[PDB]
Design a protein around this motif. Structure first.
Motif, mmCIF file in Angstrom:
data_model
loop_
_atom_site.group_PDB
_atom_site.id
_atom_site.type_symbol
_atom_site.label_atom_id
_atom_site.label_comp_id
_atom_site.label_asym_id
_atom_site.label_seq_id
_atom_site.Cartn_x
_atom_site.Cartn_y
_atom_site.Cartn_z
ATOM 1 N N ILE A 69 0.857 -1.167 0.000
ATOM 2 C CA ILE A 69 0.000 0.000 0.000
ATOM 3 C C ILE A 69 0.897 1.221 0.000
ATOM 4 N N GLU A 70 0.660 2.130 -0.944
ATOM 5 C CA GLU A 70 1.579 3.234 -1.179
ATOM 6 C C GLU A 70 0.943 4.611 -1.087
ATOM 7 N N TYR A 71 1.807 5.606 -0.921
ATOM 8 C CA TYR A 71 1.448 7.018 -0.949
ATOM 9 C C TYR A 71 1.320 7.505 -2.392
ATOM 10 N N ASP A 72 0.183 8.111 -2.727
ATOM 11 C CA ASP A 72 0.029 8.778 -4.016
ATOM 12 C C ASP A 72 -0.258 10.274 -3.860
ATOM 13 N N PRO A 73 0.708 11.134 -4.250
ATOM 14 C CA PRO A 73 0.600 12.601 -4.159
ATOM 15 C C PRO A 73 -0.494 13.219 -5.037
ATOM 16 N N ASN A 74 -1.045 12.454 -5.973
ATOM 17 C CA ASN A 74 -2.031 12.981 -6.903
ATOM 18 C C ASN A 74 -3.475 12.748 -6.484
ATOM 19 N N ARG A 75 -3.686 12.338 -5.238
ATOM 20 C CA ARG A 75 -5.027 12.089 -4.740
ATOM 21 C C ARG A 75 -5.048 12.131 -3.230
ATOM 22 N N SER A 76 -6.257 12.093 -2.669
ATOM 23 C CA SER A 76 -6.454 12.066 -1.225
ATOM 24 C C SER A 76 -6.250 10.649 -0.757
ATOM 25 N N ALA A 77 -6.764 9.729 -1.560
ATOM 26 C CA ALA A 77 -6.759 8.316 -1.226
ATOM 27 C C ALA A 77 -5.372 7.684 -1.322
ATOM 28 N N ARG A 78 -5.220 6.522 -0.701
ATOM 29 C CA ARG A 78 -3.978 5.775 -0.808
ATOM 30 C C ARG A 78 -4.106 4.836 -1.996
ATOM 31 N N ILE A 79 -2.992 4.252 -2.431
ATOM 32 C CA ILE A 79 -3.042 3.291 -3.536
ATOM 33 C C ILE A 79 -2.584 1.868 -3.167
ATOM 34 N N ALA A 80 -3.053 0.883 -3.926
ATOM 35 C CA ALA A 80 -2.656 -0.499 -3.699
ATOM 36 C C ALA A 80 -1.954 -1.079 -4.913
ATOM 37 N N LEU A 81 -0.746 -1.572 -4.682
ATOM 38 C CA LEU A 81 -0.006 -2.295 -5.696
ATOM 39 C C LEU A 81 -0.511 -3.726 -5.753
ATOM 40 N N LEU A 82 -1.000 -4.122 -6.919
ATOM 41 C CA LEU A 82 -1.402 -5.496 -7.145
ATOM 42 C C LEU A 82 -0.360 -6.203 -7.987
ATOM 43 N N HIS A 83 0.008 -7.412 -7.571
ATOM 44 C CA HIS A 83 0.706 -8.359 -8.439
ATOM 45 C C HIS A 83 -0.302 -9.392 -8.897
ATOM 46 N N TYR A 84 -0.630 -9.381 -10.180
ATOM 47 C CA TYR A 84 -1.521 -10.393 -10.708
ATOM 48 C C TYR A 84 -0.760 -11.704 -10.769
ATOM 49 N N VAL A 85 -1.467 -12.820 -10.627
ATOM 50 C CA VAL A 85 -0.851 -14.129 -10.780
ATOM 51 C C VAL A 85 -0.472 -14.261 -12.251
ATOM 52 N N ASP A 86 -1.069 -13.384 -13.050
ATOM 53 C CA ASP A 86 -0.778 -13.186 -14.460
ATOM 54 C C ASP A 86 0.650 -12.697 -14.629
ATOM 55 N N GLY A 87 1.228 -12.193 -13.545
ATOM 56 C CA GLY A 87 2.542 -11.586 -13.586
ATOM 57 C C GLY A 87 2.493 -10.086 -13.807
ATOM 58 N N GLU A 88 1.395 -9.613 -14.380
ATOM 59 C CA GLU A 88 1.237 -8.190 -14.633
ATOM 60 C C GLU A 88 0.961 -7.388 -13.362
ATOM 61 N N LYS A 89 1.520 -6.181 -13.291
ATOM 62 C CA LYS A 89 1.342 -5.311 -12.134
ATOM 63 C C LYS A 89 0.462 -4.085 -12.448
ATOM 64 N N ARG A 90 -0.358 -3.672 -11.486
ATOM 65 C CA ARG A 90 -1.270 -2.548 -11.677
ATOM 66 C C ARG A 90 -1.454 -1.821 -10.360
ATOM 67 N N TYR A 91 -1.941 -0.581 -10.418
ATOM 68 C CA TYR A 91 -2.405 0.098 -9.209
ATOM 69 C C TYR A 91 -3.917 0.215 -9.243
#
Ligand SMILES: [Mg+2]
Ligand SMILES: [Mg+2]
Ligand SMILES: [Mg+2]
Ligand SMILES: [Mg+2]
Ligand SMILES: [Mg+2]
Ligand SMILES: [Mg+2]
Ligand SMILES: [Mg+2]
Ligand SMILES: [Mg+2]
Ligand SMILES: [Mg+2]
Ligand SMILES: [Mg+2]
Ligand SMILES: [Mg+2]
Ligand SMILES: [Mg+2]
Ligand SMILES: [Mg+2]
Ligand SMILES: [Mg+2]
Ligand SMILES: [Mg+2]
Ligand SMILES: [Mg+2]
Ligand SMILES: [Mg+2]
Ligand SMILES: [Mg+2]
Ligand SMILES: [Mg+2]
Ligand SMILES: [Mg+2]
Ligand SMILES: [Mg+2]
Ligand SMILES: [Mg+2]
Ligand SMILES: [Mg+2]
Ligand SMILES: [Mg+2]
Ligand SMILES: [Mg+2]
Ligand SMILES: [Mg+2]
Ligand SMILES: [Mg+2]
Ligand SMILES: [Mg+2]
Ligand SMILES: [Mg+2]
Ligand SMILES: [Mg+2]
Ligand SMILES: [Mg+2]
Ligand SMILES: [Mg+2]
Ligand SMILES: [Mg+2]
Ligand SMILES: [Mg+2]
Ligand SMILES: [Mg+2]
Ligand SMILES: [Mg+2]
Ligand SMILES: [Mg+2]
Ligand SMILES: [Mg+2]
Ligand SMILES: [Mg+2]
Ligand SMILES: [Mg+2]
Ligand SMILES: [Mg+2]
Ligand SMILES: [Mg+2]
Ligand SMILES: [Mg+2]
Ligand SMILES: [Mg+2]
Ligand SMILES: [Mg+2]
Ligand SMILES: [Mg+2]
Ligand SMILES: [Mg+2]
Ligand SMILES: [Mg+2]
Ligand SMILES: [Mg+2]
Ligand SMILES: [Mg+2]
Ligand SMILES: [Mg+2]
Ligand SMILES: [Mg+2]
Ligand SMILES: [Mg+2]
Ligand SMILES: [Mg+2]
Ligand SMILES: [Mg+2]
Ligand SMILES: [Mg+2]
Ligand SMILES: [Mg+2]
Ligand SMILES: [Mg+2]
Ligand SMILES: [Mg+2]
Ligand SMILES: [Mg+2]
Ligand SMILES: [Mg+2]
Ligand SMILES: [Mg+2]
Ligand SMILES: [Mg+2]
Ligand SMILES: [Mg+2]
Ligand SMILES: [Mg+2]
Ligand SMILES: [Mg+2]
Ligand SMILES: [Mg+2]
Ligand SMILES: [Mg+2]
Ligand SMILES: [Mg+2]
Ligand SMILES: [Mg+2]
Ligand SMILES: [Mg+2]
Ligand SMILES: [Mg+2]
Ligand SMILES: [Mg+2]
Ligand SMILES: [Mg+2]
Ligand SMILES: [Mg+2]
Ligand SMILES: [Mg+2]
Ligand SMILES: [Mg+2]
Ligand SMILES: [Mg+2]
Ligand SMILES: [Mg+2]
Ligand SMILES: [Mg+2]
Ligand SMILES: [Mg+2]
Ligand SMILES: [Mg+2]
Ligand SMILES: [Mg+2]
Ligand SMILES: [Mg+2]
Ligand SMILES: [Mg+2]
Ligand SMILES: [Mg+2]
Ligand SMILES: [Mg+2]
Ligand SMILES: [Mg+2]
Ligand SMILES: [Mg+2]
Ligand SMILES: [Mg+2]
Ligand SMILES: [Mg+2]
Ligand SMILES: [Mg+2]
Ligand SMILES: [Mg+2]
Ligand SMILES: [Mg+2]
Ligand SMILES: [Mg+2]
Ligand SMILES: [Mg+2]
Ligand SMILES: [Mg+2]
Ligand SMILES: [Mg+2]
Ligand SMILES: [Mg+2]
Ligand SMILES: [Mg+2]
Ligand SMILES: [Mg+2]
Ligand SMILES: [Mg+2]
Ligand SMILES: [Mg+2]
Ligand SMILES: [Mg+2]
Ligand SMILES: [Mg+2]
Ligand SMILES: [Mg+2]
Ligand SMILES: [Mg+2]
Ligand SMILES: [Mg+2]
Ligand SMILES: [Mg+2]
Ligand SMILES: [Mg+2]
Ligand SMILES: [Mg+2]
Ligand SMILES: [Mg+2]
Ligand SMILES: [Mg+2]
Ligand SMILES: [Mg+2]
Ligand SMILES: [Mg+2]
Ligand SMILES: [Mg+2]
Ligand SMILES: [Mg+2]
Ligand SMILES: [Mg+2]
Ligand SMILES: [Mg+2]
Ligand SMILES: [Mg+2]
Ligand SMILES: [Mg+2]
Ligand SMILES: [Mg+2]
Ligand SMILES: [Mg+2]
Ligand SMILES: [Mg+2]
Ligand SMILES: [Mg+2]
Ligand SMILES: [Mg+2]
Ligand SMILES: [Mg+2]
Ligand SMILES: [Mg+2]
Ligand SMILES: [Mg+2]
Ligand SMILES: [Mg+2]
Ligand SMILES: [Mg+2]
Ligand SMILES: [Mg+2]
Ligand SMILES: [Mg+2]
Ligand SMILES: [Mg+2]
Ligand SMILES: [Mg+2]
Ligand SMILES: [Mg+2]
Ligand SMILES: [Mg+2]
Ligand SMILES: [Mg+2]
Ligand SMILES: [Mg+2]
Ligand SMILES: [Mg+2]
Ligand SMILES: [Mg+2]
Ligand SMILES: [Mg+2]
Ligand SMILES: [Mg+2]
Ligand SMILES: [Mg+2]
Ligand SMILES: [Mg+2]
Ligand SMILES: [Mg+2]
Ligand SMILES: [Mg+2]
Ligand SMILES: [Mg+2]
Ligand SMILES: [Mg+2]
Ligand SMILES: [Mg+2]
Ligand SMILES: [Mg+2]
Ligand SMILES: [Mg+2]
Ligand SMILES: [Mg+2]
Ligand SMILES: [Mg+2]
Ligand SMILES: [Mg+2]
Ligand SMILES: [Mg+2]
Ligand SMILES: [Mg+2]
Ligand SMILES: [Mg+2]
Ligand SMILES: [Mg+2]
Ligand SMILES: [Mg+2]
Ligand SMILES: [Mg+2]
Ligand SMILES: [Mg+2]
Ligand SMILES: [Mg+2]
Ligand SMILES: [Mg+2]
Ligand SMILES: [Mg+2]
Ligand SMILES: [Mg+2]
Ligand SMILES: [Mg+2]
Ligand SMILES: [Mg+2]
Ligand SMILES: [Mg+2]
Ligand SMILES: [Mg+2]
Ligand SMILES: [Mg+2]
Ligand SMILES: [Mg+2]
Ligand SMILES: [Mg+2]
Ligand SMILES: [Mg+2]
Ligand SMILES: [Mg+2]
Ligand SMILES: [Mg+2]
Ligand SMILES: [Mg+2]
Ligand SMILES: [Mg+2]
Ligand SMILES: [Mg+2]
Ligand SMILES: [Mg+2]
Ligand SMILES: [Mg+2]
Ligand SMILES: [Mg+2]
Ligand SMILES: [Mg+2]
Ligand SMILES: [Mg+2]
Ligand SMILES: [Mg+2]
Ligand SMILES: [Mg+2]
Ligand SMILES: [Mg+2]
Ligand SMILES: [Mg+2]
Ligand SMILES: [Mg+2]
Ligand SMILES: [Mg+2]
Ligand SMILES: [Mg+2]
Ligand SMILES: [Mg+2]
Ligand SMILES: [Mg+2]
Ligand SMILES: [Mg+2]
Ligand SMILES: [Mg+2]
Ligand SMILES: [Mg+2]
Ligand SMILES: [Mg+2]
Ligand SMILES: [Mg+2]
Ligand SMILES: [Mg+2]
Ligand SMILES: [Mg+2]
Ligand SMILES: [Mg+2]
Ligand SMILES: [Mg+2]
Ligand SMILES: [Mg+2]
Ligand SMILES: [Mg+2]
Ligand SMILES: [Mg+2]
Ligand SMILES: [Mg+2]
Ligand SMILES: [Mg+2]
Ligand SMILES: [Mg+2]
Ligand SMILES: [Mg+2]
Ligand SMILES: [Mg+2]
Ligand SMILES: [Mg+2]
Ligand SMILES: [Mg+2]
Ligand SMILES: [Mg+2]
Ligand SMILES: [Mg+2]
Ligand SMILES: [Mg+2]
Ligand SMILES: [Mg+2]
Ligand SMILES: [Mg+2]
Ligand SMILES: [Mg+2]
Ligand SMILES: [Mg+2]
Ligand SMILES: [Mg+2]
Ligand SMILES: [Mg+2]
Ligand SMILES: [Mg+2]
Ligand SMILES: [Mg+2]
Ligand SMILES: [Mg+2]
Ligand SMILES: [Mg+2]
Ligand SMILES: [Mg+2]
Ligand SMILES: [Mg+2]
Ligand SMILES: [Mg+2]
Ligand SMILES: [Mg+2]
Ligand SMILES: [Mg+2]
Ligand SMILES: [Mg+2]
Ligand SMILES: [Mg+2]
Lengths: 275, 48
Positions: free
Chosen positions: A81-103
């Motif tokens: 779970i990370e800090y995002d300066p571009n919003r109020s909310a926090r962000i979540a780093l997902l690692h897909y079992v697909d191998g692909e990464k997204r927020y």
RNA sequence: GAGCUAGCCCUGGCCAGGGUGAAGCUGGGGUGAGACCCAGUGGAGGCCCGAACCGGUGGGGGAUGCAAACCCCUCGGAUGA
RNA sequence: GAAUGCCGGCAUGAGUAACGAUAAAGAGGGUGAGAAUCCCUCUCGCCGUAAGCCCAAGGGUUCCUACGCAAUGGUCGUCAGCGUAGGGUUAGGCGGGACCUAAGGUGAAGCCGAAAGGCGUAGCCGAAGGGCAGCCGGUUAAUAUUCCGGCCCUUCCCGCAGGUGCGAUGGGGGGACGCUCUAGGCUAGGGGGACCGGAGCCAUGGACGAGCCCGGCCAGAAGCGCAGGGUGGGAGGUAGGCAAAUCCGCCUCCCAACAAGCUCUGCGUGGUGGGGAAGCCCGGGUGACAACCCCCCGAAGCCAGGGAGCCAAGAAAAGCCUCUAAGCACAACCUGCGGGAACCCGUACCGCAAACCGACACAGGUGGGCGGGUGCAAGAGCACUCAGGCGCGCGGGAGAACCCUCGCCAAGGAACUCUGCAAGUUGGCCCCGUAACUUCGGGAGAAGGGGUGCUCCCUGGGGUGAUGAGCCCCGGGGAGCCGCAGUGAACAGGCUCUGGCGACUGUUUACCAAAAACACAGCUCUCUGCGAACUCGUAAGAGGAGGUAUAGGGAGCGACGCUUGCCCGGUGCCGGAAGGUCAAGGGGAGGGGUGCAAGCCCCGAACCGAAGCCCCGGUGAACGGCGGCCGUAACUAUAACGGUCCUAAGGUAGCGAAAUUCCUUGUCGGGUAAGUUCCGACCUGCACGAAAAGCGUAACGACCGGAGCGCUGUCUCGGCGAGGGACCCGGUGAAAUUGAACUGGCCGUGAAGAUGCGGCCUACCCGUGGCAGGACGAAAAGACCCCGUGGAGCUUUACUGCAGCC
RNA sequence: CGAUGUCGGCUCGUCGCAUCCUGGGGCUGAAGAAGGUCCCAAGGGUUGGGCUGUUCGCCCAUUAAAGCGGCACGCGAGCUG
RNA sequence: GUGGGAGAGGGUGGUGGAAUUCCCGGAGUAGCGGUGAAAUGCGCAGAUACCGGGAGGAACGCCGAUGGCGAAGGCAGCCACCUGGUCCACCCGUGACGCUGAGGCGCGAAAGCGUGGGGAGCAAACCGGAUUAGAUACCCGGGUAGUCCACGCCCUAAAC
RNA sequence: GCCGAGGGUAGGGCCCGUGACUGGGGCGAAGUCGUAACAAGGUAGCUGUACCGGAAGGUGCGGCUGGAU
RNA sequence: GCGGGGUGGAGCAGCCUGGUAGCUCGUCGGGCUCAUAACCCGAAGGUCGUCGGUUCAAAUCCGGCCCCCGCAACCA
């Protein structure tokens, strides 16, 4: 939580800072950041078109997944779970079992190390995404789309939540963060749960400088100007308004409605907001 | 004190120079008049 | 015409030295567990004193000036909007 | 002949002001027609976190040399940034280009706009950012990381050898990033040496000494050593990284893991190559076969992409590694070695300045790096001084007034004045000590006071050494010496009490206002459901925002504490499928023009018909508003109480002669010998009052009041002294102004204030230093006022339009 | 009105006399001392401080007395502001 | 200790229906409401009364009792979890380990306060209508804090 | 030379007297206004607290009976 | 200087548009009450600030004087 300071400087006395306890990764994922073109509030003509903007901290923009129907049935683990300066909310780093990464924007209750999934079949648990039609009536939801496949537009700010009220044909009925009651299409994706960091609103900026860091320059009152500049301009000494309070451009600014009446989305808004 | 003239060659050639004048209708018109008046220099000398 | 000036944008740079001593942490005490108190450690801040640097408070001089805004003494800020 | 007319010439002021930092000069010698001013020597003074040195900008031959002095140079000139001529700038490695991208700019596709043109993902351009290979010395009058010497390195072409699935603008990795703080180990630089080398010196009373003075290094491939940075290895699966992929991502497994290994960098050593002082003989020679050593201090720089903590969360692209695709696998690539090849542009000189920006050889302005020593607690502060550079391009005298800058002052001590304005005082470090109040941080350097030099003896901890010597750092105790005086010079707070206003740090009228003004965190109202509202643009397109109601716009209020009352009649805004009015349009009762006619043409009542307005209702942290007369209490006085009229409703708490109080120096109290101000009270508040916020509030203030202590030339009340001017002599030589002038006083007169008219009085001609009463002195076609059917900015329920919106 | 700088203070004064004091007098409801009132007289003199921008005024302490006016409400090419 | 029991004792998390209010569709017409009687108010812009749909909050009817539980304040739909006190029987264990309690510490109804939610009903303040000599009241129509939730304060009572 | 009565400088603590004015309190009384309490005191009373009102008081919330029927 | 005003005892109407003086309280007489208040029933009192004028007639329209309320009094 929210962290206070002892009054060792005049400005510290009131200043409060976020608690940042939910953060487990102090670095953004490189392959998902890109540079933020700061505008200063100036458009492609170069003109200020949103007054009092500029001079805040530099920011790297985190690429967020506001679709999610992008990858139905492929689960993913919550890596951080990370800090995002571009919003109020926090962000979540997902690692897909697909191998692909997204927020995605981080819901409240999300755990580092849990799993989430999107699609018509997802269990109704925190972090999953489904077309609105398959979420049970009454459960509270966030990151809601407004039209199908157009992206999540509603409930994106810290602590906010929309809630499903009932159904009517192809459409579901949402109570938006503002209390407005609206029909949204049932194929609009949505993520179960509310957005996290709800303690956001209790933050006391504390001094002029904090606002400056946020890229917000000082705002000057109309009453402090001259008639050339503003309706409230001039007068000897202080002065009341002496007309209905107005914007720099003259329109009425206490009470006057501005939504276009003949706007096509009117057929879909059931009840205008409250309070 | 700091006066108004503070020379700069890049500033100069980009602002008043021949390519600057050529790109825009106002600049072309200047070159026309300075050519019709018989000016020896159509554009400020600046050495680069 | 923004080579002066104002705001913003991109990219670089600069701020001697001293002082005060926030949180945190460690140990000791305390208690059912705590709150908390003490000591050391620590090094926070549109914090303090003061050069560079940025200013321009009071006074004096200057007044066909050294100068179409300067000079001297004094004074404000100096990790921050 | 006048137009403050135009162009030019020449006067007056006048041999007057001035000759541009008060860092400062003197003599000897030389040169020459001529010398305070050029060269040389010696002495004196000034800068030294510069007034020295090196880069970038800008300037563009100002550089060096020869020959000159009409003009330029504030004087002079033999000199010069000046005139004439000649000479001078040397690169694969330094900077820019043949590399990369940033804002921005431009722009295939595409979109938009009367035309001109406006936009626009890709790409392209764009640098003081990324990237990339040279270090030390010598040489020229003038260039040097460029020439030369030595030792090094880079890319490109070809060949040879070994090796490999080679191959990209395509996938991926990396490049790749903040602020503060900071470890270890190094280097730069510095201090000392009784050690190493050195020409020589013994003065003037003493010293032939562990004496004085001078110097004791620089660059360097591979290798090596010390210190750091970067990085796990293998296997199996694999639906993701827009084709493929052995890469990368994800999952499982085995070995390894504060290690080693692998690799990159800094520092040391290092074949070798250089340098090399004082002093004294004419830049050079010598010193000299110069020596080239030990110890200490030590970076902000280096190893570096190091470490830690914090929140405001900190560029891109290429180079480089890797993966494959078409292809090609006699090719191609990698590694080693060799030969060959390596273009264009800059390089002179000034550069905190007499060469740049300021019309000037102008006390102003101008970014980056170096910036030595000693002492004062530190330091880039301060005093002196090194290297280096200067004495500021008019001088010589005199010793008035007056002026500026400065020094001291009997007794008094704010009596000065709008005001302690200004100037005294205080002043660094160490120790003791420190109040109301408080938001518990502060207030606080509160206040107040003691210490401070030097010599000798004793002793404690720390760093580098080795655990010791030495060197360096931080101390403790005792006894003594001297002076008026020990932060002995220089740099370095005066303090306190008490009100107003603004919470605070900040910001502002460049160049008369820095404030109580603006901003500010914080509070409230209100708009906005997202192709948001709103803003710019005709539009396209943008900002808002790659945000999404804990978000964005608009407005008022302005930390914080306790609070923010009553009025919705008018204005605004909000809600109101009724009723009224309502334009084009529909509709066509009826009427008209014309034709022989069917026909053509024109007017046209009812009824249908939007928003807006009317009308019903809401709404104050929306515009705004928040009464009058009369009577009443065992004496008075006053009115808790009452009467009536009016209103949409009649000012609540708190505060009040106030940044608001007219009468007003209200009245009373305090302070003073005396107080139109100040503080505390009272309340008939001319004319406070609750977010144009009300009453308070610790801390803060170059804000504005009032008082006291300290101390003072502020004053009684002035005096003396210093220097730069003022004065005189030589040199150069302005200015505004000026109808012409042979330009006196008084009492009068005069367009009403006369050198100029009248009468009288006074007065020999002409200068110099001085003073400012007059010439309704100078300067500015009065900035106030009025006038002009002159203008401009601002307002609105002035008029009429337009954009915008319905 | 192609400019006659404007309150108060400071500085420097000079003049008028309808005299505040000091000198000479007459009258007195002048015993003395001390006053009252008018006449003569402009020679000289006519203080320091608190308040306020003040002129003025009030007040404190003194005094022989603490005079009133004119000079562009004297005096900004003399200063303050 | 062993074995049992009753209970609105306390905390967390859920969830059920009755009713009030507002909104929506229907159908329907001239009044509804309220008091002692009235007025204000609401209603032809379609109220009340009735049927269907929906939204939200608060409190739990019958059981319910002269009952139960807690040290006190107090605690009432139902469900699960976590937890306290307390009684009983057996007479098994320890062997006076007891009682009280200045200070201390904790708990502590309502109202009240701070930050944030929530707001259906009720309702200080406030507005209006009546009553009245007056009516800053009692009665009626409206209505804001608050009443509810979380965390943190306040610590009072005819806390009996 | 030390200590030293005390004198002097500076800042603090407790107490006393006093002060324009101001807050309620006791008493006086033959005053004004209303009638809150004692009877169901004519709205049962009292209560802590909160907001409000010329004054007794009123109202909200919860509590007590020390409340007639 | 401009606008408004004076009417039984108090406070307001009537004035514009000439003939006609009204409302609430208060006073006085009666009633209910033991008594007072309240309440109920009756009743008195303005010659309209003055002096002048217009008219057939003036609270009313016009002038004078008087007193009261409000606003103005600025550049200077
Ligand atoms: Mg949290
Ligand atoms: Mg805080
Ligand atoms: Mg803290
Ligand atoms: Mg804390
Ligand atoms: Mg502080
Ligand atoms: Mg503060
Ligand atoms: Mg936050
Ligand atoms: Mg934060
Ligand atoms: Mg967080
Ligand atoms: Mg990237
Ligand atoms: Mg962006
Ligand atoms: Mg652009
Ligand atoms: Mg443009
Ligand atoms: Mg804007
Ligand atoms: Mg802006
Ligand atoms: Mg975030
Ligand atoms: Mg906030
Ligand atoms: Mg920011
Ligand atoms: Mg803001
Ligand atoms: Mg503002
Ligand atoms: Mg203002
Ligand atoms: Mg203004
Ligand atoms: Mg403008
Ligand atoms: Mg305008
Ligand atoms: Mg305007
Ligand atoms: Mg205005
Ligand atoms: Mg104004
Ligand atoms: Mg004004
Ligand atoms: Mg103003
Ligand atoms: Mg005003
Ligand atoms: Mg203003
Ligand atoms: Mg104001
Ligand atoms: Mg005004
Ligand atoms: Mg206003
Ligand atoms: Mg106004
Ligand atoms: Mg107004
Ligand atoms: Mg939509
Ligand atoms: Mg510049
Ligand atoms: Mg340039
Ligand atoms: Mg450049
Ligand atoms: Mg430029
Ligand atoms: Mg050009
Ligand atoms: Mg030519
Ligand atoms: Mg041109
Ligand atoms: Mg940058
Ligand atoms: Mg600094
Ligand atoms: Mg820590
Ligand atoms: Mg600061
Ligand atoms: Mg600071
Ligand atoms: Mg400071
Ligand atoms: Mg100054
Ligand atoms: Mg001064
Ligand atoms: Mg100076
Ligand atoms: Mg400072
Ligand atoms: Mg500082
Ligand atoms: Mg910083
Ligand atoms: Mg003529
Ligand atoms: Mg002329
Ligand atoms: Mg002339
Ligand atoms: Mg002429
Ligand atoms: Mg001329
Ligand atoms: Mg002269
Ligand atoms: Mg000159
Ligand atoms: Mg000179
Ligand atoms: Mg000087
Ligand atoms: Mg000479
Ligand atoms: Mg000569
Ligand atoms: Mg010479
Ligand atoms: Mg030095
Ligand atoms: Mg030039
Ligand atoms: Mg040269
Ligand atoms: Mg010459
Ligand atoms: Mg010359
Ligand atoms: Mg010159
Ligand atoms: Mg010669
Ligand atoms: Mg020259
Ligand atoms: Mg070379
Ligand atoms: Mg080429
Ligand atoms: Mg480029
Ligand atoms: Mg570059
Ligand atoms: Mg090299
Ligand atoms: Mg050369
Ligand atoms: Mg081969
Ligand atoms: Mg590639
Ligand atoms: Mg990055
Ligand atoms: Mg960078
Ligand atoms: Mg040293
Ligand atoms: Mg060395
Ligand atoms: Mg080492
Ligand atoms: Mg795969
Ligand atoms: Mg090395
Ligand atoms: Mg040598
Ligand atoms: Mg030799
Ligand atoms: Mg030898
Ligand atoms: Mg980072
Ligand atoms: Mg890019
Ligand atoms: Mg193939
Ligand atoms: Mg290979
Ligand atoms: Mg080429
Ligand atoms: Mg070239
Ligand atoms: Mg060169
Ligand atoms: Mg030079
Ligand atoms: Mg300078
Ligand atoms: Mg420099
Ligand atoms: Mg120089
Ligand atoms: Mg100039
Ligand atoms: Mg110029
Ligand atoms: Mg000029
Ligand atoms: Mg020049
Ligand atoms: Mg010069
Ligand atoms: Mg200069
Ligand atoms: Mg010192
Ligand atoms: Mg020092
Ligand atoms: Mg200094
Ligand atoms: Mg030295
Ligand atoms: Mg000189
Ligand atoms: Mg002389
Ligand atoms: Mg003296
Ligand atoms: Mg004194
Ligand atoms: Mg004294
Ligand atoms: Mg003063
Ligand atoms: Mg000093
Ligand atoms: Mg005190
Ligand atoms: Mg304290
Ligand atoms: Mg103090
Ligand atoms: Mg000595
Ligand atoms: Mg001395
Ligand atoms: Mg000095
Ligand atoms: Mg100081
Ligand atoms: Mg004080
Ligand atoms: Mg005052
Ligand atoms: Mg204040
Ligand atoms: Mg201010
Ligand atoms: Mg301020
Ligand atoms: Mg405040
Ligand atoms: Mg501030
Ligand atoms: Mg500051
Ligand atoms: Mg100005
Ligand atoms: Mg200014
Ligand atoms: Mg100007
Ligand atoms: Mg200006
Ligand atoms: Mg200013
Ligand atoms: Mg200031
Ligand atoms: Mg301002
Ligand atoms: Mg402000
Ligand atoms: Mg506030
Ligand atoms: Mg537009
Ligand atoms: Mg666009
Ligand atoms: Mg965007
Ligand atoms: Mg947004
Ligand atoms: Mg503030
Ligand atoms: Mg403000
Ligand atoms: Mg307080
Ligand atoms: Mg009221
Ligand atoms: Mg209203
Ligand atoms: Mg209204
Ligand atoms: Mg209005
Ligand atoms: Mg109004
Ligand atoms: Mg207002
Ligand atoms: Mg009486
Ligand atoms: Mg008062
Ligand atoms: Mg006041
Ligand atoms: Mg006032
Ligand atoms: Mg007054
Ligand atoms: Mg006055
Ligand atoms: Mg008086
Ligand atoms: Mg008085
Ligand atoms: Mg005063
Ligand atoms: Mg009074
Ligand atoms: Mg305002
Ligand atoms: Mg301040
Ligand atoms: Mg200030
Ligand atoms: Mg003097
Ligand atoms: Mg002297
Ligand atoms: Mg002298
Ligand atoms: Mg002579
Ligand atoms: Mg003549
Ligand atoms: Mg005259
Ligand atoms: Mg005349
Ligand atoms: Mg005359
Ligand atoms: Mg004459
Ligand atoms: Mg004549
Ligand atoms: Mg005469
Ligand atoms: Mg004169
Ligand atoms: Mg004069
Ligand atoms: Mg004159
Ligand atoms: Mg004359
Ligand atoms: Mg004159
Ligand atoms: Mg002049
Ligand atoms: Mg002028
Ligand atoms: Mg003219
Ligand atoms: Mg004129
Ligand atoms: Mg003029
Ligand atoms: Mg004029
Ligand atoms: Mg006039
Ligand atoms: Mg006209
Ligand atoms: Mg006319
Ligand atoms: Mg105009
Ligand atoms: Mg609009
Ligand atoms: Mg005039
Ligand atoms: Mg003239
Ligand atoms: Mg003139
Ligand atoms: Mg006698
Ligand atoms: Mg006589
Ligand atoms: Mg006399
Ligand atoms: Mg005389
Ligand atoms: Mg006076
Ligand atoms: Mg006076
Ligand atoms: Mg006079
Ligand atoms: Mg005068
Ligand atoms: Mg003057
Ligand atoms: Mg004057
Ligand atoms: Mg004059
Ligand atoms: Mg004159
Ligand atoms: Mg003078
Ligand atoms: Mg003034
Ligand atoms: Mg109908
Ligand atoms: Mg409680
Ligand atoms: Mg409450
Ligand atoms: Mg009981
Ligand atoms: Mg004694
Ligand atoms: Mg009663
Ligand atoms: Mg009762
Ligand atoms: Mg009352
Ligand atoms: Mg009430
Ligand atoms: Mg109870
Ligand atoms: Mg009438
Ligand atoms: Mg009539
Ligand atoms: Mg009776
Ligand atoms: Mg008649
Ligand atoms: Mg009649
Ligand atoms: Mg009559």
């Amino acid at each position: 939580a929210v962290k206070k300071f002892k009054p060792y400087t005049p400005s510290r006395r009131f200043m409060t800072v976020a608690d940042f306890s939910e953060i487990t990764k102090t670095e953004p994922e490189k392959s998902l950041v890109k540079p933020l073109k700061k505008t200063g509030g100036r458009n492609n003509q170069g003109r200020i078109t949103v007054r009092f903007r500029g001079g805040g901290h530099k920011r790297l923009y985190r690429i967020i997944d506001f679709k999610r129907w992008d990858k139905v049935g492929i689960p993913a683990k919550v890596a951080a779970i990370e800090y995002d300066p571009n919003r109020s909310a926090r962000i979540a780093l997902l690692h897909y079992v697909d191998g692909e990464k997204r927020y995605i924007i981080a819901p409240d209750g999300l755990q580092v190390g849990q799993q989430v999934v999107a699609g018509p079949d997802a269990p109704i648990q925190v972090g999953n995404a489904l077309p609105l039609r398959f979420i049970p009536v009454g459960t509270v939801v966030h990151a809601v789309e407004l039209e199908p496949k157009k992206g999540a537009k509603l409930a994106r700010a810290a602590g906010t939540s929309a809630q499903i009220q009932g159904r009517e044909g192809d459409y579901v009925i949402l109570r938006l963060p503002s209390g407005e009651l609206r029909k949204v299409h049932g194929e609009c994706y949505a993520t179960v749960g509310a957005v996290g960091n709800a303690d956001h609103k209790n933050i006391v900026l504390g001094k002029a400088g904090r606002s400056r860091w946020l890229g917000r320059r000082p705002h000057v009152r109309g009453a402090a100007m001259n008639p050339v500049d503003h309706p409230h301009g001039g007068g000897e000494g202080r002065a009341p308004r002496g007309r209905p309070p107005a914007s720099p451009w003259g329109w009425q600014t206490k009470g006057l409605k501005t939504r276009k009446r003949r706007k096509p989305s009117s057929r879909f808004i059931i009840a205008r907001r409250k309070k | 004190m700091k006066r108004t003239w503070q020379p700069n060659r890049r500033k100069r050639a980009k602002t008043h120079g021949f390519r600057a004048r050529m790109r825009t209708p106002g600049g072309r018109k200047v070159l026309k008049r300075r050519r019709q008046k018989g000016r020896w220099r159509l554009t400020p000398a600046v050495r680069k």
